[PDB]
């Protein structure tokens, strides 16, 4: 059990065994960066959030309304892309919409 | 935090304000009391809302009326409209809602010109 | 040819029924 | 006075599974809240007493067709008693119910939840057990198993009710028991392409059929597959399928409105045709195998189809947009209603069907009216036109319009229907045409705003205009002085209604207040401030509270009753508001909708809904859909009145128009979720007239059988006001003694007797008896009826209804028979 | 339990918009640097 692992294993990573309770807005897609320093959790009812999970630094939590198919970071943890109900929008680190991608319609899966 | 009601009244050009607050029975029209305004032969038309509604409805309020414009007759109709709307409006906002509807019924069963002023346009006949 | 003129005219009437219906729907039926 | 809920009317179908009776002659059709049965071999409809909280998801029936289990969304269950139309058990499945199959042995039912398969014992009812009542928690559960992987679309039992079988949403079907068999292991029917919409048994339970969503239908034997066979279809996917195992036939309804019909021991097309432009939602199939029933869920579109005599026994549809007006014929037997769909259609009060649908307007029909006559249906629309329909020939006389293009929103025809008034929002003059000429007689002046309610007097001497110049107007046309007489009001006039004697008129104005005016000497006589009486509070997208929204606090439409005593009043709200005229008191108030997939129902809407995005019923989840035309949002941004786009989730609660029935005891609300009729319920509630201590049914029947005094027994049974006793003494006195009783009968029970013998003429098989009653009553009570003529004007017209549905229904036949036999006997 | 946190009213999506830094052109940005250096360095150039 992870009570046995969290006890028998060092305290800096015993910090890293955490949980996070978000009931109301759908099943939560998650994706890290490729250094592991940030994660998006997308929520299919709309709720998309970018965070630094170790230091608890919530870089963004955008609400976004309509449904969400997939979220993913780009080359850094500085831009991310989310596949919406109809288009795929990409966003800056502050969660500000830099641009809507119109040529990709009802994208269901993404890979960078 | 006082119980204050502002109310207007109209005729041809005479416009009258009346402020009705929580008082002790007085009605003063341009400073002078109500039984002194509007030369003698029309004070019955001043009193018409009072002795429709009964003075027991008025023994808890104070009505302060400023009247401007018009002639004597139009100032009388502006005053009595401001009286009637003043008490209906005070009983709208401060005492219960049933008593408003009862006062509107008494005034409307007498004459609707105590509440709604109907100014005359003209008739260009066909 | 008159077949081209009348084919163009019928396609333009189809376009105006579709577009004019969408305009009255945007105005929420406050048209003439 | 005392109005309960009669039939919902004007929608044949909404979302939901529909079902036949086991006799085959009753169709169980879900409307939004409720379930309407309509008797189909003898057309007569009825709605049940209950009303769910959400839209009906499903209905199941016991094989002895006496017990009906309905499901609203999120599993909110009911089961009611259909022979005695009473509501019996409440229940709640906790998941939403996506499949439901009641056992053919009347013993179990399997429900398929969002993945769960729970088989339940059916509760024994007080009609079943000997000295038994309602239990507390009557549903006991036999099994539950969640060994599936996705949703369960369909459930189909065996014939002997020992196996049942589940059509997935993943890809598969599964065959399951009720108790452990000795050579059976519960097993899985393998891969389709998309996911099975059905999986049906035969009679011989060896081959199992299974019908997917991508067209393919497989036959399995013992456990591999004996022959998979598809069928082509161009741009559509298979969305419903029903299989009659006795007659070996499979219907299959699709996404493009077409259904195919296939005899299947081997794949063999009987037939196919298209019924809608939209998808086919639900297929049920008769116990005989002769009638097929198809529900298309987007429009109304309920239809029943004879598959061998290829013919529509039923093809009915509601309104797919908001209604705008209803009226009644002066007979009182049919209500007509217009909508923003573009059609004006004519509904029969009995039998629950539309008898006509007129489609010659475009773009939404505002108003709708009759004359005195009931022959001609004058209607008005935003097309710009007032169409004057001929209702005996089902086609229009004359479509009037204005010289400059308008869009009329209000309409009033003279009672002697030779003068038309209409009025618009674009112009703010009022246009009057002449019917017996065809031209435009005048356009009339006076208003400083768009005239928003027009009404002629039932005398027909006075037109009355109510306009957004906060004013009303008496238009005295017909004499040599076409004069006006304004009524300076306080706010924007919403409505105008006449007292049926033309001496008094009521206006709704935008405050929420009604007021009452003399017409001869124009002078306000009375008035209601009804702002608090009408507040059906807190739609979603209200960040304001329920009692602060100005916008549900005004009456759109008002009517008087046929006596002239009570008013109906109703607005963009939840409460219909029934006032009086003499004492001005609110008599009664009705909650239109209990629904919760409507919007304006709950004032004090609960905070469990409000997620950290907003209301959870406001998140656009259209991308959570597996079909392309469901996913595509082809709406226009910011359209209030009719658009083809129509996302249309959570419509609000309005009444779009009330009107009283011309015969007594009924009531119409043109609301959003149908067309509700309320009726003065009289068969449960005891209500005497002037009654003493001795007067029992033993006393009425005592002076009926022991010492026969027919006048005292008749006034005695009236004086109880019990229908069984007045029927007993009515069919007890003889047709010689009728003229004795009526020749000496009290004058103040006469219109009760006229209404009773009118109902007995129209309903009981006693022609010359009841016509002798009417003959005696009008012969003796002639000067009284002619002298009063307004006090009794409804009683004389329910009688004239009865003696003209007798004069035209059987004496056309008597004339045609006597002159036909006169010819064939002349040779 | 507790009266919940009130939503705002006129909320719009955060879009990048005109007159930023990272959208704005580099030569326009050098024009802004020239105008600032010539605005701070207050010099009325009168050649002799």
TrEMBL record, chain A:
Gene Ontology cellular-component annotations: 90S preribosome; small-subunit processome
Keyword Iron-sulfur on entry: no
Keyword S-adenosyl-L-methionine: no
Source taxon at top rank: Eukaryota
GO biological process per UniProt: maturation of SSU-rRNA from tricistronic rRNA transcript (SSU-rRNA, 5.8S rRNA, LSU-rRNA)
Subcellular location: Nucleus, Nucleolus
Keyword list, A-Z: Nucleus, Repeat, rRNA processing, WD repeat
Functional description taken from the UniProt entry: Involved in nucleolar processing of pre-18S ribosomal RNA.
Protein name from the UniProt record: U three protein 7
Native organism taxonomy: Eukaryota, Fungi, Dikarya, Ascomycota, Pezizomycotina
UniProtKB/TrEMBL annotation, chain B:
GO function terms (MF aspect): RNA binding; structural constituent of ribosome
Superkingdom, natural source: Eukaryota
Pfam families named in the record: Ribosomal_S9
Listed InterPro entries: Ribosomal_Su5_D2-typ_SF, Ribosomal_uS9, Ribosomal_uS9_CS, Ribsml_uS5_D2-typ_fold_subgr
Cellular component, GO annotation: cytosolic small ribosomal subunit
Recorded coiled-coil stretches: none
Binding site for Mg(2+): 125
Keywords tagged on the record: Metal-binding, Ribonucleoprotein, Ribosomal protein
GO biological process, one term: maturation of SSU-rRNA from tricistronic rRNA transcript (SSU-rRNA, 5.8S rRNA, LSU-rRNA)
UniProt similarity note: Belongs to the universal ribosomal protein uS9 family.
Protein's name in the database: 40S ribosomal protein S16-like protein
Organism of provenance: Chaetomium thermophilum (strain DSM 1495 / CBS 144.50 / IMI 039719)
Taxonomy of the source species: Eukaryota, Fungi, Dikarya, Ascomycota, Pezizomycotina
TrEMBL record, chain C:
Covered residues, full protein: 608 to 639 of 785
Protein family membership: Belongs to the MPP10 family.
Subcellular location: Nucleus, Nucleolus
Entry protein name: Putative U3 small nucleolar ribonucleoprotein protein
Annotated signal peptide: none
Source taxonomy: Eukaryota, Fungi, Dikarya, Ascomycota, Pezizomycotina
UniProtKB/TrEMBL annotation, chain D:
GO CC terms, sorted: Pwp2p-containing subcomplex of 90S preribosome; small-subunit processome
Keyword Repeat recorded: yes
Biological process, per Gene Ontology: maturation of SSU-rRNA from tricistronic rRNA transcript (SSU-rRNA, 5.8S rRNA, LSU-rRNA); ribosomal small subunit assembly
Signal peptide limits: none
InterPro entries membership: PWP2 (IPR027145), Quino_amine_DH_bsu (IPR011044), SSU_processome_Utp12 (IPR007148), WD40/YVTN_repeat-like_dom_sf (IPR015943), WD40_PAC1 (IPR020472), WD40_repeat_CS (IPR019775), WD40_repeat_dom_sf (IPR036322), WD40_rpt (IPR001680)
Keywords: Repeat, WD repeat
WD repeats (start-end): 145-182, 189-221, 316-357, 358-399, 444-485, 493-527
Domain Small-subunit processome Utp12: 721-826
Highest taxon, organism lineage: Eukaryota
Family: Belongs to the WD repeat PWP2 family.
Designated name of the protein: Periodic tryptophan protein 2-like protein
Source organism phylogeny: Eukaryota, Fungi, Dikarya, Ascomycota, Pezizomycotina
């Amino acid at each position: 059990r992870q009570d046995e692992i969290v006890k028998e294993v060092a305290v800096e990573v015993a910090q890293k065994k955490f949980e996070l309770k978000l009931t109301e807005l759908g099943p939560y897609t998650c994706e890290y960066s490729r250094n592991g320093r940030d994660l998006i959790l997308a929520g299919r009812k709309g709720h998309v959030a970018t965070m630094d999970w170790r230091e608890g630094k919530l870089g963004c939590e955008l609400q976004l309304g309509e449904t969400v198919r997939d979220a993913r970071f780009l080359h850094n943890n500085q831009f991310f892309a989310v596949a919406q109900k109809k288009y795929v929008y990409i966003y800056d680190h502050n969660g500000v919409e830099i641009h809507c991608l119109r040529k990709h319609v009802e994208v269901s899966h993404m890979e960078f | 935090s006082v119980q204050a009601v502002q109310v207007f009244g109209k005729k041809k050009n005479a416009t009258a304000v009346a402020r009705c607050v929580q008082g002790k029975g007085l009605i003063k029209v341009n400073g002078k009391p109500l039984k002194l305004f509007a030369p003698e032969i029309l004070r019955a038309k001043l009193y018409e809302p009072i002795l429709i509604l009964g003075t027991d409805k008025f023994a808890d309020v104070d009505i302060r009326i400023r009247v401007a414009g018009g002639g004597h007759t139009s100032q009388v109709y502006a005053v009595r409209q401001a009286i009637a709307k003043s008490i209906v409006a005070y009983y709208a906002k401060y005492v219960d809602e049933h008593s408003k509807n009862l006062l509107k019924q008494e005034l409307i069963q007498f004459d609707r010109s105590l509440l709604v002023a109907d100014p005359r346009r003209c008739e260009p006949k066909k | 040819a008159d077949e081209k003129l009348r084919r163009d005219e019928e396609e333009i009437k189809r376009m105006w029924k579709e577009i004019s219906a969408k305009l009255d729907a945007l105005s929420s039926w406050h048209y003439k | 006075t005392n109005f309960k809920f009669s039939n919902l009317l004007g929608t044949v179908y909404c979302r939901g599974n529909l079902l036949f009776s086991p006799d085959g002659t009753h169709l169980f059709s879900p409307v939004g809240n409720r379930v309407t049965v309509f008797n189909l071999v003898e057309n007569k409809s009825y709605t049940f007493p209950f009303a769910h909280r959400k839209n009906i998801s499903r209905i199941g029936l016991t094989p002895q067709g006496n017990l009906l289990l309905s499901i609203d969304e999120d599993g909110q269950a009911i089961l009611t008693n259909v022979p005695r139309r009473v509501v019996l058990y409440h229940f709640s499945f906790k998941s939403p119910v996506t499949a439901l199959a009641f056992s053919p042995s009347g013993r179990h039912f399997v429900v398929g939840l969002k993945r769960k398969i729970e088989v339940w014992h059916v509760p024994s009812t007080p009609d079943t057990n000997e000295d038994g009542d309602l239990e507390f928690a009557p549903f006991v559960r036999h099994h539950t198993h969640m060994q599936h992987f996705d949703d369960v679309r369909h459930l189909e039992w065996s014939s002997d009710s020992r196996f049942f079988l589940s059509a997935s949403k993943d890809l598969t079907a599964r065959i399951w028991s009720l108790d452990t068999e000795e050579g059976f292991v519960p097993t899985v029917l393998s891969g389709h392409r998309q996911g099975v919409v059905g999986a049906y048994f035969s009679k011989d339970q060896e081959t199992i059929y299974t019908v997917s969503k991508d067209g393919a239908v497989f036959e399995w034997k013992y456990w591999r597959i004996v022959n998979k066979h598809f069928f082509m279809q161009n741009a559509a996917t298979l969305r419903c399928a029903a299989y009659h195992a006795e007659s070996n036939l499979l219907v299959a309804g699709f996404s493009n409105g077409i259904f195919g019909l296939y005899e299947m021991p081997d794949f063999n097309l009987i037939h196919t045709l298209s019924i809608s432009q939209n998808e086919i939602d639900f297929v049920t199939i008769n116990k005989s195998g002769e009638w097929l029933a198809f529900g298309a869920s987007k429009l109304g579109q309920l239809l029943v189809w004879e598959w061998q005599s290829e013919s529509y026994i039923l093809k009915q549809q509601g309104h797919f947009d908001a209604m705008n007006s209803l009226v009644y014929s002066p007979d009182g037997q049919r209500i007509v209603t217009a909508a923003d769909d573009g059609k004006i259609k004519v509904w029969d009060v009995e039998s629950g069907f539309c008898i006509v649908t007129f489609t010659e307007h475009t773009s939404g029909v505002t108003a709708c009216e009759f004359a005195k006559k009931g022959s001609v249906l004058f209607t008005a629309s935003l097309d710009g036109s007032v169409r004057a329909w001929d209702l005996i020939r089902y086609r229009n006389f004359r479509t009037f319009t204005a010289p400059e293009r308008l869009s009329f929103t209000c309409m009033a025809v003279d009672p002697s229907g030779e003068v038309i008034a209409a009025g618009s929002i674009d112009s703010f003059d009022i246009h009057i045409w002449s019917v017996q000429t065809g031209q435009l007689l005048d356009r009339l002046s006076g208003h400083e705003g768009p005239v928003s309610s027009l009404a002629f007097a039932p005398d027909g001497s006075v037109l009355v205009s109510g306009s957004w110049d906060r004013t009303a107007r008496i238009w005295s046309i017909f004499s040599r002085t076409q004069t006006s007489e304004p009524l300076q009001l306080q706010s924007d006039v919403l409505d105008v209604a006449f007292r049926p004697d033309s001496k008094q008129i009521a206006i709704s104005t935008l405050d929420g207040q009604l007021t009452f005016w003399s017409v001869s000497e124009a002078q306000q006589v009375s008035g209601v401030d009804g702002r608090r009486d009408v507040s059906g509070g807190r739609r979603i997208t209200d960040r304001r509270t329920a009692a602060n929204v100005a916008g549900t606090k005004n009456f759109n439409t008002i009517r008087y009753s046929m006596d002239g005593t009570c008013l109906l009043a109703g607005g963009n709200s939840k409460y219909i508001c029934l006032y009086s005229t003499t004492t001005m008191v609110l008599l009664k108030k009705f909650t239109v909708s209990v629904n919760l997939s409507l919007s304006g129902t709950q004032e004090f809407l609960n905070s469990k809904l409000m997620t950290e995005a907003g209301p959870v019923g406001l998140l656009d989840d259209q991308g959570e859909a597996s079909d392309l035309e469901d996913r595509i949002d082809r709406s226009l941004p910011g359209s209030k009145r009719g658009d083809p786009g129509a996302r249309k989730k959570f419509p609000e609660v309005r009444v779009s128009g009330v009107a009283f029935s011309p015969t007594g005891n009924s009531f119409c609300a043109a609301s959003t979720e149908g067309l509700l009729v309320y009726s003065l319920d009289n068969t449960v509630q005891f209500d005497p007239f002037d009654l003493n201590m001795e007067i029992t049914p033993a006393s009425t029947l005592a002076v009926l059988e022991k010492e026969k005094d027919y006048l005292k027994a008749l006034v005695m049974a009236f004086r109880l006001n019990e229908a069984g006793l007045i029927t007993r003494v009515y069919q007890a006195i003889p047709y010689t003694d009728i003229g004795l009783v009526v020749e000496q009968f009290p004058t103040v029970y006469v219109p009760r007797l006229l209404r009773f013998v009118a109902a007995q003429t129209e309903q009981s098989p006693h022609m010359e008896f009841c016509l002798l009653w009417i003959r005696a009553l009008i012969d003796k009570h002639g000067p009284w009826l002619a002298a009063n003529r307004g006090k009794v004007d409804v009683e004389l017209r329910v009688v004239a209804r009865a003696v003209a549905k007798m004069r035209d229904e059987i004496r056309r036949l008597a004339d045609e028979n006597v002159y036909m036999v006169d010819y064939l006997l002349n040779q | 339990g507790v009266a919940k946190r009130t939503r705002k009213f006129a909320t719009v999506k955060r879009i990048i918009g005109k007159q930023d830094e990272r959208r704005k052109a580099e030569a326009v940005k050098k024009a802004e640097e020239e105008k600032r250096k010539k605005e701070k360095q207050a010099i009325r150039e009168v050649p002799q």
